[PDB]
């Protein structure tokens, strides 16, 4: 049980991300942008994966099931309020954006705000604080 | 020189720049005579036993 298996994977590649196999699975899939601790735990609960095993101990079928549930949360009764992209301003769809998708979403949001020349977009463009913080003394 | 044990028989008074040291008179335990004057750092009172690593020196009023 405590001896390392022959199929143990030191490094996994999931969604163009290097997942360390030495970490526990829940805190190992948090290496993916868009997956935090809460979302990782709920995904693994939906996937019926034992939380006590390391990332390398997972089989290929288990990894594939985890990836599928991660990329399609709504099909597995993961509630909308759990998602980091709710009611998208362009499509109105609920989803969980991950990794390059998350980066593209951030760039698109900033580009839209700058294109309409909203105040927050201008603050982002100038590189200043955008949530009303004082800038006189901090942020140097 | 062997380590010596002395017994405080009288607390003379405070000494040092900030008054941190206490000047006392000690009588040797090996020989009841040969009482000398020593400077002690820390709270000391009559009847305490000091361990003199060098028993030849004298306080000389610090």
């Amino acid at each position: 049980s405590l001896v390392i298996p022959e199929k143990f994977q030191h490094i996994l590649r999931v969604l163009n991300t290097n997942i360390d196999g030495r970490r526990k699975i829940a805190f190992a899939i948090t290496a993916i942008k868009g997956v935090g601790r809460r979302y990782a735990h709920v995904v693994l609960r939906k996937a019926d994966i034992d939380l006590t095993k390391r990332a390398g101990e997972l089989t290929e079928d288990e990894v594939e099931r985890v990836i599928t549930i991660m990329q399609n949360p709504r099909q597995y009764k993961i509630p909308d309020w759990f998602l980091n992209r709710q009611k998208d301003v362009k499509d109105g769809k609920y989803s969980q954006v991950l990794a390059n998708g998350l980066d593209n979403k951030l760039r698109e949001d900033l580009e839209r705000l700058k294109k309409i020349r909203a105040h927050r977009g201008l603050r982002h463009f100038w590189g200043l604080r955008v949530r009303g913080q004082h800038t006189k003394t901090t942020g140097r | 020189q062997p380590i010596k044990l002395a017994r405080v028989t009288k607390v003379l008074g405070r000494t040092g720049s900030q008054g941190q040291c206490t000047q006392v008179r000690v009588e040797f335990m090996d020989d009841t005579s040969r009482s000398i004057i020593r400077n002690v750092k820390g709270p000391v009172r009559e009847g305490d036993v000091l361990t003199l690593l060098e028993s030849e020196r004298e306080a000389r009023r610090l």
Binding site: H41, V42, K77, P79 | -
Partner: protein, 141 residues
């Protein structure tokens, strides 16, 4: 004769939770695998069967002190909320969790609504808890 107050309370809670799970008539909400138990928590409970433990704890609290409502339960299960770079403060538990636990215990007929408001143990619930306490004492001895 053994009553609840005669035994170790943590061991009693574990035994009562095991008893409730083994009986298997306790109604469990569909969202137990998704929620966290309070806004001051950072993660969902480690134990998959946290609902049975919470129900056993609630029943023990009602045994010790009857007439407690959902607000009292949320006060009981409240804790410290850390606020990032701001100081920490007391925070209450999940009202839905407390209410569902109380309703499930009522469904088991171990809990009934008190006349003056809140909930209390039925004689059947008191009997069940005293039997569990006797089992805990026997196991310890």
């Amino acid at each position: 004769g053994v009553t609840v107050k005669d035994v170790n309370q943590q061991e009693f809670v574990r035994a009562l939770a095991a008893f409730l799970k083994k009986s298997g008539k306790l109604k469990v909400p569909e969202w137990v695998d998704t929620v966290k138990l309070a806004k001051h928590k950072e993660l969902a409970p480690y134990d998959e069967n946290w609902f049975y433990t919470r129900a056993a704890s609630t029943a023990r609290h009602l045994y010790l002190r009857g007439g407690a409502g959902v607000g009292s339960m949320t006060k009981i299960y409240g804790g410290r909320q850390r606020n990032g770079v701001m100081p920490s403060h007391f925070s209450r538990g999940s009202k839905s969790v407390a209410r569902r636990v109380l309703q499930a215990l009522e469904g088991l007929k171990m809990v009934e609504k008190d006349q003056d408001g809140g909930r209390k143990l039925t004689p059947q619930g008191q009997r069940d808890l005293d039997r569990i306490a006797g089992q805990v004492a026997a196991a310890n001895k």
